[PDB]
Every structure is written in structure tokens, then in C-alpha cells.
Amino acid sequence: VSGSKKTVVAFIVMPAKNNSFTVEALKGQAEVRALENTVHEVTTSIGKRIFDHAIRYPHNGLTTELPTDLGELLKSSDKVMLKRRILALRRPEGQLPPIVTHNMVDDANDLILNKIRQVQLFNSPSDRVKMIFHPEFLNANNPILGLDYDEFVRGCHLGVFPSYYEPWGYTPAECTVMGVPSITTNVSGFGSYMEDLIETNQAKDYGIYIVDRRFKAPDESVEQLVDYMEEFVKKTRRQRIN
Amino acid sequence: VSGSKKTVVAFIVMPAKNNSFTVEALKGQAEVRALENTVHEVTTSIGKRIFDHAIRYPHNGLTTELPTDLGELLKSSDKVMLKRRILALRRPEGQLPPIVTHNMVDDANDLILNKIRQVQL
Amino acid sequence: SRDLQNHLLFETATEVANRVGGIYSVLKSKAPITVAQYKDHYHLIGPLNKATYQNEVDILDWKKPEAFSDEMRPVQHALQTMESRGVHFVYGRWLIEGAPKVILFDLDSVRGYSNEWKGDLWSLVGIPSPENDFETNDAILLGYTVAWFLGEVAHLDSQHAIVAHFHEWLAGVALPLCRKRRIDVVTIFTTHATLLGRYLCASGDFYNCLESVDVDHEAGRFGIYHRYCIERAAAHSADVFTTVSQITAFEAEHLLKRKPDGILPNGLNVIKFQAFHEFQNLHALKKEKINDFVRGHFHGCFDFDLDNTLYFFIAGRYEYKNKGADMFIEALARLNYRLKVSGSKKTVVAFIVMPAKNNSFTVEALKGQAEVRALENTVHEVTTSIGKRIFDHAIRYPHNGLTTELPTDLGELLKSSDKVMLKRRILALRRPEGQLPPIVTHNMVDDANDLILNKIRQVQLFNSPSDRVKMIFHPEFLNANNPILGLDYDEFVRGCHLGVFPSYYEPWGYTPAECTVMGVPSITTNVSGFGSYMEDLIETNQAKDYGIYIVDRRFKAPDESVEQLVDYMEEFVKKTRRQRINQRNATEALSDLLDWKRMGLEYVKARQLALRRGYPDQFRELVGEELNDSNMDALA
Ligand SMILES: O=c1ccn([C@@H]2O[C@H](COP(=O)(O)O)[C@@H](O)[C@H]2O)c(=O)[nH]1
Ligand SMILES: O=c1ccn([C@@H]2O[C@H](COP(=O)(O)O)[C@@H](O)[C@H]2O)c(=O)[nH]1
Ligand SMILES: O=P(O)(O)OC[C@H]1O[C@H](O)[C@H](O)[C@@H](O)[C@@H]1O
Ligand SMILES: [Ba+2]
Ligand SMILES: [Ba+2]
């Protein structure tokens, strides 16, 4: 609606019975690797040629200090192999970037997945919000995403843990310690404790977003949460950092 | 005379009383390295740019699979560096490259030099 | 009659399309901030540099009807009025950020009028002019051409109120001509130094007795009377009179005999970062390169640990006394004793970057960095063999009788070949018995007579292993094209820890100012332009926590100044990394105060107090009343 150019990848890290990773997410990553490797070879070839031109100038009728036409740097067998890499990257007609990383055991009756489909966030070029459900605890040995949970946390921009029953919740707290801003509910123990210690409108400048899940309807809550989420998506880099 | 395009570089490795390498020769090799290195910083940016184009095509309106204008790959901050490198390499007006890599002790009497000098190589 | 709101601005100095001094860079960085306000109401004026202007100036067609708008037509007519006299001049734009619009008068197309004007000044003001002085002649020619210009515009344009800013005694010839000819513009004069101030400091006690010096006797003593006259006139003839700093403002009152209305401090075009803390990361990176250099320079004499070494620099024009190298080298010799006495575990490399007559780097320097490269390469070759071997052990375990997960014994990873080449490498580093890491990186034209090398010798700093203070003198401006320390000056400064500029005559000095902007702490003096300005904005014990150390060179014996400087250096050395980091963040905060985006409001207060004295009523009409007259700070 607002015509925003931002995007939001949104991750779900929760353990669910599974048979390890999908051959799609594994093959995918491997194919992106092959491309980088190839880009390295091709930039090495460029380097030789850039460098040679640079050394030989002005001699042998070179008129410019630098190459000016990309055909001097990029060649036949270069473009040939590079395209092969782009080819093996492209996915089947109208096939769309999954919402699971793993082969679920009971994908049919899975609440998270069933909810996503019900909301129809299937990751389409037009969707400004993407969904990736990782049904496994994060460990830096996992072949598609080699991060330990906490490392990942450091990497993310915002932590959304809109709880109903959560007597403390280390999750939003850990998050706060790694200096990541979080959305938590006033019915979560942590959220409760933080709601008290600072005035509520202030706590938004401290990345502590408390949603009212108590003195508000289960559809006023959801709106307050989007009021938060969308406020965050408005912030600049300068603002995100500070 | 035969208008050959070939070249012979001819070494003479024979000990003689010297004062180590000339500041020349030494500068020489260092300036060529600053180029070598910079050209690697650059190729690396280019690497990013090729990779990004290659990753997203056909989307965002990339009609060619690979970049086509050199300009898509080479920013002026790149150019400006490589241009500085190339200036550092430029010999003074009319100074040809040296017949010797050392400060000789008795340069004016050296049998070999005086001989190269005589045949004007 | 004339509108003070929509008003024009005309800035004039010598240093316009040509770099002739410190003035050049002030105007250059200021354009961005001024053009953003005036847009095309702002015009700069200077002499046409026949040689180098072809590069600097974006030459434009001033004849077009599009070349201006409607309200900016008075210029169009007044420019052709000069072409209707045969006066050649180049118009267009300066190829710098903010793209300011320039009028650069060719003084060749006005040369014949000299003998008429040279006498005219001798009768109108009373200024003698020996014509051997290529420079005073070129100043008069400018003064008059500019007056002949500004007079013809104040007549043509009657809507805008016109303001004329003049920088230095060279471009201030036209200022008494704005008084006696009584043109209807407002004039400001800014002097960046005093002609007397320079010459008096060349031999000598300046700051204690310039209250009691005969202004007329000294100018004739140095043969700089004919020059001093144009400066003296210019200071009084102008509505507003200003220097760049407090300490200069004080000396201009006694040597140019008039109190300044205020201060126009030298701001900078501060480059800013998305991340505030990028400057911290930047340091990290640059320091790594200084290290790279330092290893090369102490090769085979490497006893100290870098992760516990503090770079210190001095830098700028070679003016041994004025810049205070003498105090820097003295103090350093002292600090070295202290550190030895106090049994400190720290070291201090102290660079000195001042251009001197040299025949380029020494074979030593080169070989040094050449060898450290070869080591580095061989090391790298060795570690991939190791890598091959660690990896294989990793992937084989527990098979083939590997009891441990990883290798346990180095002999598994290092082989004979690896050990041999490494050892050969280290031998290349190792230096002749009792040779010491040099105090200099270049072959000097006159090493015996060099002042800096004398001093370093006299205090016996030779980078002996037992000295806590080492000294390197790089007698040449930095530059990323360097073989040995390939950095641009600014990149160096970031990478440092403490700039140390104990000046004795410095009207301003951007050297410590740039320093702070990059987030590096600096020692300076209460007699420095910037130094005095800084002891003004902060309480002194407060200022130390902002990385600004001010040495009193004004109410103290030179020896005590020296001792106080040692103190600051000692105070700093003792800091922990946490503390050093914090204080660097602190000093960066100060950055904004030295920005044109703030030092530039002072050029606003100076401009409006010129629009206060020139048309005293129309301003009293516009604001509602008249405000205090005798100050720049009293007006706003
Ligand atoms: O991939 C993960 C995700 C979470 N946790 C940890 O497991 C706990 C689960 O959160 P909760 O169920 O206690 O809220 C948290 O404290 C968090 O630190 C992990 O070790 N790995
Ligand atoms: O290696 C250097 C040292 C200084 N400077 C610059 O030259 C000027 C000399 O200092 P000063 O004499 O103007 O104080 C300073 O503005 C400084 O930025 C350089 O460009 N390179
Ligand atoms: O040079 P020093 O004062 O020891 O500063 C050392 C510090 O430099 C910067 O702040 C870097 O970002 C830090 O990683 C490093 O610890
Ligand atoms: Ba305006
Ligand atoms: Ba004060």
C-alpha cells in the first residue's frame, strides 16, 4: 500500500520433527557457491588484463591510462562459464522460494506452516515480507546456515517475540544483551519487568517494544504489533544503529 | 633490420665491487607492487558487481545475463587509484632503464660497463 | 531603498583559482556552506592565474541571456562595462564541491594604468610603491579593478544590498577605495595574519612585548613598510574588521592598531560517516599499515610489542621554531628519560613529517621493507603446507592410527624445507653488529646542517633498543604512492594516536584542527590560532578529556612550557586502550564545532553587522529597533 521499497526476511527458529534439510536448500546454496568461485576466476583474469594495460601505457599505441571497453577485460570462455552458473541458478517455471528449509515429518498438520499458507505468504516477487521457517535449533555446523544461534541473533535487525505465557523468557533478554532491539509482550515476564523500569514511550528509543496483550483485544494487539513493526521498517541506517 | 618483434633481455651475473642496490631498482620493484596490489582491490569490487548482476538477472530489469558497459563495473574511485599507480611508474623525461642494478665502486673503470657503454646498448 | 534580506555577496582574496597559501583551502571548503545560502547571489573575486586556471576553472559563456536570471542582470551589464574598457577576465565555475561562481580578472589587461594608480595611492592614502616588488604592484592593480567593478554594480543594481568580503592585505587594496570613493556597498576585512607578526617571530619575545613596539619603526626596519600600509589602511577602511582567532585578534589590535569586531574561525568541510564509529574502525586499519612500516624500519632490531606502541606525530611546513619541532624533540628526549626511570613497559614511535631538501628514500629503508615482504610471503607459503597437513589429520582421524583429533607435535606440520627458507628469511632481516634503526628515511641534501637532525643528535635519540621513545623523520609530505609508508596524509593521521603541534606562531593551523576532525587527540598551544579558540570553548581540565591538550607558551618560561608538554605526553602514554578509545570518541564529538556547518554562522554574524552599520535605519526598521553596534556577538 505505502509503496515501500524495503523488504523483510523473517525467520522462525523452532524445533519440529523432521528428516533434515531439503535437497533444494542444500543444492541452492551449493549453486550460489559455484558462482562466487567462478566470479573469482573471472576477476583474476580481469586483473591480469587491467594490470597489463596499466604497465604498458602509453606504449604500443594505448591512448588511455585505463581500459575503456569491457571487451578488453571480459572474454569468450569467461562469459561462457559465467552464464552456465546463472543457468543452474534459475528455478523451474513459477516455482517459488520455499518456506521450509527442512523435510518435515507431518507437514500437513503443522501449525506454523498451516498458518502461513492460511495467510498466504508464499514468497512472491510482490510480497514485501518473506517467510523462512527453520525447524531446528541453529548450530554453526549446519550446512546451509553456519551460525550458532547467538551469532545469528547478532546478525538480525529486530526480535519479535509476542508472547502470551512466558514467565521470564531468556530469548528477548539475550537479544537485548547482544544489542538487538526487540518486540515483547507485557504478559511475558521479561517484558513485564522492562515495562516497569522505563517509561513506555521512552523504551522504544531503547529498542524495547512492549505490546499490550492484556488490557486489549486479540485484534488490537495484532494491530499494535504491526504499528511497531512498520515504525521500525521506516527507520534509516543512522537511526537503526543509534 | 629483419624487423623482428622479438626481444632479448640479457643478464650478466658476475660479482664486482659494489655498494648494494640502487634506490632506483628498489623503488622500481615497489611501485610495480603498489600497482599489483591496487589492481587486486579493484578486481575485488568488480567481483562483487559481476556477482550481483549475475545473481539477480532477469529481475530488476537486467536484459543481459552479464554486465555490458564497463562502467557498471568500474567506479571512479577505482579509476582514480589505478591512475595514481600509473603515475608513480612514469620515468623522468628521457631517462632510459639502467644497464646495472647496483652502485658500483669503481664505475668509471669497470670493464663490463665501459664495454656495454662502448657498443651503445 | 535597498533590501537587506535578498542581498548579494562578493568575496575577494588572492588565493582563488590558484593555491598560494592557507587561504586557498578556507574559501574552497567554505563554498559548499555559502553557496547553499546564496545560490547565485554569491560571487568570488580574484586575479586570473594565467598558468593554472585552465584546470581549476569551469570556463563559461557569460554573454548568454540564460547565463543569469532577471534580478541578477546588474552583473551582466557591469561585466560588459568592463569589456567596454578592454578589461579581460575569466568567468564560470570553480571545479570544487558546491560549485561556486568566479570572476577572475586578468591583470595583464590593466597593466598600463599602474603608474597612474601607483601615484594615486601615494596621494589618496599615502602608500609608497617601489616597483621592484612584483607583488605590491599586482595587489594595487587588483584593488582598483575590483573597486572599478563594485562601484559600477552598486550603481546598476538598486534592489539588493551589496556586501564585499576581503581576505588578507593583498586583496584589501580596494578597501580604502570603498571609503573615500564612498561606494554604497558594505565591506568586511579579514586578516589571517599580521605582516609584522611574521617578521618579528623570524628572529626573536613576541607575545610578552608587542604592546611596546613601534608599528612604524619595525615595518621600515624589515623593509616591509609599503606592504604594511595597505594592511593598516584595510583594517580601518572597512565596516567590520576581523581576524581568524583570538590570539591573532589580540596582536592585530596592537600591530594594525584597531580592535576586531569579532572572530571568523577557520572551519572545515567535515566528511561524515553513516556509522559514527567508522572512524574507530578506520584507525584500526590505518594503524596496521603504520605497523607494516615500523616492522620494516626496525628490522632485526625489533624488541618492543606493537600492540602496546603509540604513534605520535608532528607535521606541516618546515618551520623549526614556529611550528615548535625544537620543543617536540626536546620534550620527547625528556619523556624518554621519564619512561626509563619509571620503568614503563610502553613504547612511542614519534614521526616528524616536514618537507626538506632530499634525494629520496635510502637504500636501507627500501631493503628493510623489501625484506619484510619476502618474509611475509614465505610465511604464507609455509602456512598453506601446514594447512594441507592439519586438514589431512582432521579428515583421517581416528583411522590410520591417529590417537588425537588434532596434531600434537609441531614436527607433524613443519618440515625441513619449511624451516630452512624461514631461517634464510630471518637472516636477511638481521642487521650489521651495533647498527641502529635510522632517525631518517631519506637521503638529505644537507644532512649536516639540517636543523631537525641536529636537534635529534644533540639530544641523542638513536632508536637504541633501550630507548622508550624512537624517532623517525620523514622529510617529505605523505602520499599513497610511497614505496615504504604508502599512505595519504589523512590516512596516516587517522592511524596515529597523538598529534603534537606545539606551535609558537600559528595564526590558525588546520593541522591540529584536521586532527580533531579525524578523531585524533592533539597537544597544542594557547598561542596557536586553533589552540586559543579551543581553550575558549572549554574549561582546561575538561578539554583534556576531549583529547585537546593546551600547552601554555604565553605566561610561562620556555623551559616550563617544555615540561608541561612532557607532562601531557606522559599522561597520555599511561592510558589504557579502553581509555584511549573513549577519549577518541570524545574528541570526535567535538568535530561538529569545527564544521563550516557551524563556524559558518560566524560569517553570517559578520555579514549582518556589516548590514547594520552601512544602512543603520533600514535594519532598525526590519528588526523593529537597533541592537548593540560595537560587536559581532552583540548583534545576534
Ligand atoms: O537456535 C536456538 C534458539 C534458541 N536457543 C536458546 O534456547 C532457549 C529457548 O527459548 P525459550 O523456549 O526458553 O524461550 C533460549 O534461551 C535460547 O537462548 C538456542 O540455544 N538455539
Ligand atoms: O604529509 C602531509 C602533511 C601535511 N599536509 C597538509 O599540509 C598543511 C601543512 O600544515 P600547516 O603548515 O598549514 O599548518 C596541512 O593543512 C596538512 O593538511 C599534507 O598534505 N601532507
Ligand atoms: O590504537 P589503540 O588506541 O590501541 O586502539 C585500538 C582499537 O582501535 C579501534 O578502536 C578499533 O576499532 C579497536 O578494535 C581497537 O581495539
Ligand atoms: Ba537566502
Ligand atoms: Ba568562555
Helix vs. strand class of chain A: alpha/beta
Distance N to C terminus of chain A: 28 Å
CATH topology of the largest domain in chain A: Rossmann fold
Q: Provide the gyration radius of chain A in Å.
A: 24 Å
What percent of residues of chain A adopt helix (DSSP H or I)?
A: 25-40%
Approximate strand percentage of chain A: 5-15%
Summarize the helices and strands and which ones pair or pack.
This is part of a larger assembly, with three copies of chain A.
Chain A: E1 8-13, E2 18-21, H1 23-56, H2 76-87, E3 102-104, H3 111-119, E4 129-134, H4 149-155, E5 159-161, H5 170-177, E6 182-185, H6 189-197, E7 208-211, H7 221-232, H8 237-241
Parallel strand pairs in A: 1-4, 5-6, 6-7
Antiparallel strand pairs in A: 2-3
Helix pairs in contact in A: 1-2
The structure holds uridine-5'-monophosphate (2 copies), 6-O-phosphono-alpha-D-glucopyranose and barium ion (BA) (2 copies).
6-O-phosphono-alpha-D-glucopyranose (G6P) binds next to helix 11 and helix 21 of chain C.
Architecture overview:
The structure is cut from a larger assembly and holds three copies of chain A. Chain A folds into two domains: 1-19 and 110-242, Glycogen Phosphorylase B (Rossmann fold); 20-109, F1FO ATP Synthase (Helix non-globular). The radius of gyration of chain A is 24 Å and the shape is elongated. In chain A, the strands form three sheets. The first copy, chain A, has a three-stranded parallel beta sheet with strand order 5-6-7, with helices on both faces. In chain A, strands 1-4 form a two-stranded parallel sheet. By secondary structure, chain A is an alpha/beta fold. Helices cover 40% and strands 12% of the residues of chain A. In chain A, strand 5, helix 5 (170-177) and strand 6 (182-185) form a beta-alpha-beta unit. Chain A has helices at residues 23-56, 76-87, 111-119, 149-155, 170-177, 189-197, 221-232, 237-241; strands spanning 8-13, 18-21, 102-104, 129-134, 159-161, 182-185, 208-211. Chains in contact: A-B, A-C, B-C. Chain A binds chain B through residues 32, 35-36, 39-40, 42-44, 46-47, 50-51, 54-55, 57, 65-70, 73-74, 79, 82-83, 85-86, 89, 125, and chain B through 32, 35-36, 39-40, 42-44, 46-47, 50-51, 54-55, 57, 59, 65-70, 73-74, 79, 82-83, 85-86, 89. The structure holds uridine-5'-monophosphate (2 copies), 6-O-phosphono-alpha-D-glucopyranose and barium ion (2 copies). The site of one uridine-5'-monophosphate has 12 residues of chain C, from helix 17. The PDB classes it as transferase. Keywords: GT-B, Glycosyltransferase. Glucose1,2cyclic phosphate bound activated state of Yeast Glycogen Synthase.
